[PDB]
Design a protein around this ligand. Structure first.
Ligand SMILES: OC[C@@H](Nc1ncnc2[nH]ccc12)C1CC1
Ligand SMILES: [Cl-]
Length: 167
């Protein structure tokens, strides 16, 4: 039993809700919130800009030190950093950005990072400003993640389409 509330159950392990991931994280304080990161951990817009703003830029300061030490992530890769005031940990996961010409096949590799954590609050990877089809992202999530994932979908209209079209 956990403190996630109001989610529709899609499969044994995948749950979904129309919600603002920032407000969800502040309420639940999950062990892990997933950021829709880029390889440079530059949290400018989308989920990343919103999460970073909610930390008063502390996420960006920590991320800049991470990059200075380790260099960029790989597309499809991840790193674990602090969750600041939102969660215990933030798993920064880089899905392919179609608006940069990146290979959509890497979306499965991106979701595999979730399997290293028993329970996560997450967005749909490569959706929104990363330019991939969200119906596809949900399908890859369901077919790749085996741990317990709570998906927050910001746009209410998109949420209804994902539910009604879910196979
Ligand atoms: O990952 C793409 C995804 N974006 C977000 N999901 C949940 N909460 C959010 N807050 C700000 C952006 C954002 C779009 C809706 C499918
Ligand atoms: Cl977005």
């Amino acid at each position: 039993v956990n403190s996630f509330s109001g989610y529709l159950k899609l499969t044994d392990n995948v749950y979904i809700k129309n919600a603002d991931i920032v407000e969800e994280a502040k309420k639940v304080k999950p062990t892990v919130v997933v950021n829709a990161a880029n390889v440079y951990l530059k949290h400018g817009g989308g989920v990343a800009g919103a999460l970073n703003k909610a930390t008063n830029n502390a996420m960006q300061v920590e991320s800049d030190d991470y990059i200075a030490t380790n260099g960029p992530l790989k597309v499809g890769g991840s790193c674990v950093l602090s969750g600041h005031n939102l969660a215990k940990h933030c798993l920064h996961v880089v899905g392919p950005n179609v608006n940069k010409g990146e290979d959509i096949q890497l979306l499965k590799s991106a979701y595999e990072n979730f399997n290293q954590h028993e329970v996560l609050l997450a967005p749909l990877l490569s959706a929104g400003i990363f330019g991939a089809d969200p119906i596809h992202s949900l399908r890859v999530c369901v077919d790749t993640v085996r741990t317990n994932v709570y998906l927050a979908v910001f746009d209410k209209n998109l949420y209804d389409k994902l539910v009604s079209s879910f196979l």
